[PDB]
Amino acid sequence: LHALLRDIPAPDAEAMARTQQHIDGLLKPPGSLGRLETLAVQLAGMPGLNGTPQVGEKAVLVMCADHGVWDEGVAVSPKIVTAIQAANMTRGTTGVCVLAAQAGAKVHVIDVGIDAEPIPGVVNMRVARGCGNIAVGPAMSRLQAEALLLEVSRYTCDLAQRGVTLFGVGELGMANTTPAAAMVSVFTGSDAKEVVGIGANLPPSRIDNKVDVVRRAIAINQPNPRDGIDVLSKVGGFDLVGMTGVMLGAARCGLPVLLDGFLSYSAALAACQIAPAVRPYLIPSHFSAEKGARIALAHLSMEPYLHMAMRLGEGSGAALAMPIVEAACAMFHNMGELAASNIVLP
Amino acid sequence: LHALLRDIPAPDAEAMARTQQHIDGLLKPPGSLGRLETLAVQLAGMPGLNGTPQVGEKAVLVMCADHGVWDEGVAVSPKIVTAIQAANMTRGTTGVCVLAAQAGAKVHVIDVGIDAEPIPGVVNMRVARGCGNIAVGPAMSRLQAEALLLEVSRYTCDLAQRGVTLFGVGELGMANTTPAAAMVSVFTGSDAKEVVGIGANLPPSRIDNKVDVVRRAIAINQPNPRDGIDVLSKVGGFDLVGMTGVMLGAARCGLPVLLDGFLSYSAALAACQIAPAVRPYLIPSHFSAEKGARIALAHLSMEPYLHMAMRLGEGSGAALAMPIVEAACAMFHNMGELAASNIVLP
Ligand SMILES: COc1ccc2c(c1)ncn2[C@H]1O[C@H](COP(=O)(O)O)[C@@H](O)[C@H]1O
Ligand SMILES: COc1ccc2c(c1)ncn2[C@H]1O[C@H](COP(=O)(O)O)[C@@H](O)[C@H]1O
Ligand SMILES: O=C(O)c1cccnc1
Ligand SMILES: O=C(O)c1cccnc1
């Protein structure tokens, strides 16, 4: 794991310089395609990409797990919805499923700790039947966190071996916006009230209780912000851990990962705390409608491309941004050149 | 034309109510897909869509023309770039071309007034060899504006007959950001300094001159803000007029039109002034990096989906947003339902 972390490659400045020059010579005013140009350059620097912006196969990894903190009354969706919805993922009827199909991406459903019987068709990496209730203690042990990180990381890099060049991260876990808020509060130093949202339609009245729970979780566990694994283990969840592991695996593999929404921002904060080398592999998708989104993104120094007021999770935003990634590649490879037209612009 | 305008259909509230109900029953927390849901409902209300969000064939119409105001030193691209780039459109090497191909859309290049010889392969609707220099007089006659509006409108609705269900608008015309700024200033009541941008890389020094030109154009022509045709004719351009005509045609046809960037916002302001019934058919794409973008969008009451810092034009932003439109349809038609899973959420 420290091995793993040690071996995350730095970006290829050489490939990036060549990319920049090629982009500048395209049939358009220099810098006119804005963030699409920046994106292309970013991809060119990713070692698993072979020195050029390119997209081969695409995968969305959905980490599913239950949370003990559900018992605190912080979520209106019945607990069983996790198990149910996870099954639906196998049937292609969920939001991520439909959006991934539209993007030509494959959905990988991974059970990291659903509190139910194993679901056929779902990848089994179950830590336990739900994590500990963070309001009264830690979500899991450090050991458990590290092992999961490891296992997911490897799974992720292994897909790379099969042609996958672009990942998307997602989750499923009733009550997950609670640990997500806890982590954000911890990593950013923001007060709970500022980062606690309505999640999956929590009634406005019920908010106060969710804020109290987050505060308790923190007071009780005393997670150390300078140790991402400490935070994840104490106030995170299996699903959050799993998402962080996808990020570590893709980066080790020198490949890009598309973030999703709020849950994903929290995992990204952890990943970056754990290994700053991860940052350059991260690509934002959309701007989550969760209250704590702005704060989270500011800390990651990220500005999403899509403003859709989305708050579903599952990796739905990630899937939706995949075409953008492909667009940057198309621009790069298929546009004509100024010189070839005898066009000269300042 | 008044006929044309009179006949723009209102949206189908009946279809929209049915759509809303169907969306609410999908396998997700109600309203969780945010703007994608709103979008779906919008499309369902469009009469040419047959009561449901659907996308058949896609087309991007690119209106090309030259401007006399170029002689005022408001643009650094050589005049000839219009003719050149227009030719390139036929070769599929431009930015819109590449992005449209990615979206599975067809590009229609229309010459409404390029100051050069006719280009083979380009649709010929040429008013004149470039429009009048708005700094010293009007761009064209009212008659000319109205005829073009008419001709483009019809062309647009005719494509509908061929399977096109989604349009995108674009342009090409060195110096076009100048009349675009003039129109915006006029329609929004904003001072020129506030809406004049760098266009296609105008050096910061040269800005002052562009502002002066815009002011002169206005002072001299005295365009009436309450008459969109008056404004277009006086301080617009053939390309701007052509874009407005696509909007009027799609709306008459009861079909959706995707806006592009800055040039397109100016045309949209005119179209809406001319016929408010047009509004509901308009769909924003991205948030142009042109200085006057925010002001323009505020007046249209529109919030774009894509924040890409793009400033190319050509209909590139429009093409880039097409997948989003298709996503809304996919969501609508392919997601499973709560009831079918025995799931009940507040
Ligand atoms: C079909 O029913 C559902 C319900 C919720 C769902 C979902 C489907 N898919 C994602 N979520 C989202 O809601 C949960 C987070 O919000 P909270 O913290 O309020 O529980 C997670 O499951 C997240 O994936
Ligand atoms: C290959 O060279 C070019 C140059 C400009 C181009 C372009 C390609 N495609 C769009 N534009 C954009 O730049 C022009 C508006 O900016 P300004 O008002 O400063 O001239 C229009 O042609 C617009 O389409
Ligand atoms: O932003 C998200 O991904 C999100 C917000 C609320 C509930 N589930 C997911
Ligand atoms: O926003 C646009 O569409 C734009 C901005 C500058 C130059 N051309 C087009």
Give a three-class secondary structure readout of chain B.
CHHHHHCCCCCCHHHHHHHHHHHHCECCCCCCCCHHHHHHHHHHCCHHHCCCCCCCEEEEEEEEECEHHHHHCCCCCCCCHHHHHHHHHCCCCCHHHHHHHHHCCEEEEEEEECCCCCCCCCEECCCCCCECCCCCCCCCCHHHHHHHHHHHHHHHHHHHCCCEEEEEEEEECCCCHHHHHHHHHHHHCCCHHHHCCCCCCCCHHHHHHHHHHHHHHHHHHCCCCCCHHHHHHHHCCHHHHHHHHHHHHHHHCCCCEECCCHHHHHHHHHHHHHCHHHHHHEECCECCCCCCHHHHHHHHCCCCCECCCCCCCCCHHHHHHHHHHHHHHHHHHHCCEHHHHCCCCC
SS (H, E, C) A41-99: HHHHCCHHHCCCCCCCEEEEEEEEECEHHHHHCCCCCCCCHHHHHHHHHCCCCCHHHHH
What token pair was written down for A41? 């350059």
Please tell me the number of the ligand nearest to residue A171's CA.
1
What token pair was written down for A29? 């005013």
Residue A202 DSSP class:
-
Query: Where do breaks (C to N over 2.5 Å) occur in chain A, by preceding residue number?
Result: none
Residue B94, phi then psi, degrees to nearest 5: -85, 170
In 3D, which of B36, B29, B324 has the Cα closest to residue A308? Answer: B36
Quote the CA–CA distance of A311 and B55 in Å, as a whole number: 25
By the 8 A CB rule, do B175 and B130 touch? no
> Checking DSSP bridges between strand A282-283 and strand A57-65, what pairing results, if any?
unpaired
- Specify the residue for token string 């020094």: B205
Evaluate whether A1-54+327-346 and A55-326 have a shared fold: no
AA identity, residue B214: V
For residue B330, what is the nearest residue in chain A, using CA coordinates?
A98
Question: Where are the domains positioned within chain A?
Answer: 1-54+327-346, 55-326
CA dihedral defined by A138, A140, A143, A146, rounded to 10 degrees?
-100
AA identity, residue B53: P
> Checking DSSP bridges between strand A282-283 and strand A257-258, what pairing results, if any?
parallel
Q: Among B67, B174, B259, B263, which is best to mutate for testing ligand 4, by the most ligand atoms less than 8 A from CB?
A: B263
- Counted across chains A and B, CB pairs separated by less than 8 A come out at 171
Q: Which helix (H) or strand (E) is A220 found in, with range?
A: helix A207-221
Written as one string, the DSSP assignment of A306-321 is B-------TTHHHHHH
Q: Does A198 touch chain B (CB under 8 A)?
A: no
Query: Whole-angstrom distance between the N-terminal and C-terminal Cα of chain B?
Result: 50
Has domain B1-54+327-346 been given CATH number 1.10.1610.10? yes
Written as one string, the DSSP assignment of A259-296 is --SHHHHHHHHHHHHH-GGGGGGEE--B---STTHHHH
AA identity, residue B87: A
3-class SS of residue A172: strand
Residues 290-309 of B with CB under 8 A from A: 303-309
Strand partners, A26: A337
- Indicate which of A24, A26, A27, A287 best probes the interface with B, i.e. most B CBs within 10 Å of its own CB: A27
CA angle at residue B303 from B299 to B308, to 5 degrees?
A: 120
CA dihedral defined by A7, A11, A13, A18, rounded to 10 degrees?
130
- Specify the residue for token string 């023309």: B65
Please tell me the number of the ligand nearest to residue B28's CA.
1
Residue A122 DSSP class:
S
Quote the CA–CA distance of B292 and B265 in Å, as a whole number: 10
Q: Is B144 assigned a ligand-binding role in the annotation?
A: no
Matching CATH number, A55-326, of 3.40.50.10210, 1.10.287.1770, 3.40.50.300, 1.10.10.10: 3.40.50.10210
Quote the CA–CA distance of B88 and B300 in Å, as a whole number: 32
Residues in CB range of A79: below 8 A, 6 or more apart? A66, A70, A115, A174
